[PDB]
Design a protein around this ligand. Structure first.
Ligand SMILES: Cc1cc2nc3c(=O)[nH]c(=O)nc-3n(C[C@H](O)[C@H](O)[C@H](O)COP(=O)(O)OP(=O)(O)OC[C@@H]3O[C@@H](n4cnc5c(N)ncnc54)[C@H](O)[C@@H]3O)c2cc1C
Length: 270
């Protein structure tokens, strides 16, 4: 079937056809593809850019849809945390989130894609480019560590879903999901608890700052112990995606990942 993203340098206006208020503080935006039998065309591991003129300036931000190339005619559903202005946090809120929230059904928005240095090829082979030209981490076949904070869950869910979808893919996924409170745990239902259907290959653990009264998981951040009990050990030569919580990629990779001995070449930040 016809691809929407036929050229990565071209921008594609897509119409907004639906908007669900989920409310983790979230929305789900559904956009129409050129037609009912189109798919988006986004390789697993890759993202899209949405770009708009907001308050007279060009703004651009990356998003990993929640729909898949299995979806058809909308193959694009995006899940959005909205950063409201006039809240705890800094005056004007966030530029793109607030704009999407403002859109009206039928408004269009520009999609550009695919973007990204990592592509999942299936059965554990990861095609990663460094500076230029991809090299397969052909073997992994077996195991991947994922550390997500807040909106960093999306790139992770994309890969988790791709693996579980393949009954013959034996790659085991270990997810460490960090958030400030049990409240911003984005996509919790939205089958994260898909652990229920695949725990032989899917290992889920949460950490939060502020833990509720009878929390069953972890609290606070990283230590290094956390990484130890919840991600595959170095000895297994796994691949590590989004090292600390995606938030402002700081620290270089994780100081905690080095500590347990994970090679910095096997740590990828989306
Ligand atoms: C690969 C990738 C995939 C992503 N996928 C998604 C996705 O699927 N869904 C998604 O929602 N995001 C995703 N993001 C996050 C990305 O920043 C978005 O474009 C997001 O919408 C942030 O942008 P903004 O323009 O609204 O905020 P900006 O205008 O960039 O504001 C930055 C903000 O500063 C802080 N801030 C501003 N206002 C507030 C507030 N009220 N409270 C707290 N902090 C505040 C927050 O740190 C926030 O990031 C992704 C990022 C990457 C790299």
């Amino acid at each position: 079937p016809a691809i929407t993203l036929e050229n990565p340098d071209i921008k594609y206006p897509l119409r907004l056809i639906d908007k669900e208020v989920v409310n983790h503080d979230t929305r789900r935006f559904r956009f129409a593809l050129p037609s009912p039998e189109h798919i988006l065309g986004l390789p697993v591991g890759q993202h899209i850019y949405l770009s708009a003129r907001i308050d007279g300036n060009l703004v651009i931000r990356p998003y990993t849809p929640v729909s898949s190339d299995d979806d058809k005619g909308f193959v694009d559903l995006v899940i959005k945390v909205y950063f409201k202005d006039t809240h705890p946090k800094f005056p004007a809120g966030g530029k793109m989130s607030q704009y999407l929230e403002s859109m009206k059904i039928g408004d269009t928005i520009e999609f550009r894609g695919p973007n990204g240095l990592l592509v999942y090829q299936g059965k554990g082979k990861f095609a990663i480019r460094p500076d230029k030209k991809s090299s397969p981490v052909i073997k992994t076949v077996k195991s991947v560590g994922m550390i997500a904070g807040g909106t960093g869950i999306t790139p992770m869910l994309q890969v988790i879903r791709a693996i579980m979808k393949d009954p013959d893919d034996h790659t085991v996924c270990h997810l460490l999901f960090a958030n400030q409170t049990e409240k911003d745990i984005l996509l919790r239902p939205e089958l994260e608890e898909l652990r229920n259907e695949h725990s032989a290959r899917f290992k889920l653990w949460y950490t939060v700052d502020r833990a509720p009264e009878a929390w069953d998981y972890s609290q606070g951040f990283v230590n290094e112990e956390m990484i130890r009990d919840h991600l595959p050990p170095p000895e297994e030569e796994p691949l590590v995606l989004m090292c600390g919580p995606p938030p402002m990629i700081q620290y270089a990779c994780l100081p905690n990942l080095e500590r347990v001995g994970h090679p910095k070449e096997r740590c990828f930040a989306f």
